[PDB]
Amino acid sequence: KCLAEHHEKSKSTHSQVGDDIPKCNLASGYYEQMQCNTQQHWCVDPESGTALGERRSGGCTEAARDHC
Numbered sequence: 001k002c003l004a005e006h007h008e009k010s011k012s013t014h015s016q017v018g019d020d021i022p023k024c025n026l027a028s029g030y031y032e033q034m035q036c037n038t039q040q041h042w043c044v045d046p047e048s049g050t051a052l053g054e055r056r057s058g059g060c061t062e063a064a065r066d067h068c
Contacts (some may be wrong), residue, residue, distance in 0.1 A: 002031050034059045043068040 002024040010016030017032035025033035032049040035042050043052050053068025 003029060034064070036064060 002022040003026070006018065007023055010018075011023065019038040022031035023033075023035045023037075024031035025031060028046055028063060030046050032044050032046040035044055037060070040055055041057070041064050042055040045052060055064075057063030057066070
């Protein structure tokens with residue numbers, strides 16, 4: 001779903017931005033894996049969809065990888 005819409009929009013026309021969308025790791029294809037944003041950046045679990053780490057640090061991948 002998230003990939004189908006995100007991809008369909010990214011391909012269709014010149015608009016392929018990813019910020020206010022349901023971040024879903026291609027690993028499983030669910031939006032309950034990771035949740036990165038332009039201003040925020042947090043992670044979740046497929047079990048239910050709850051947070052695992054904190055939400056406050058420089059950059060996204062930086063804190064996401066360093067400690068979610």
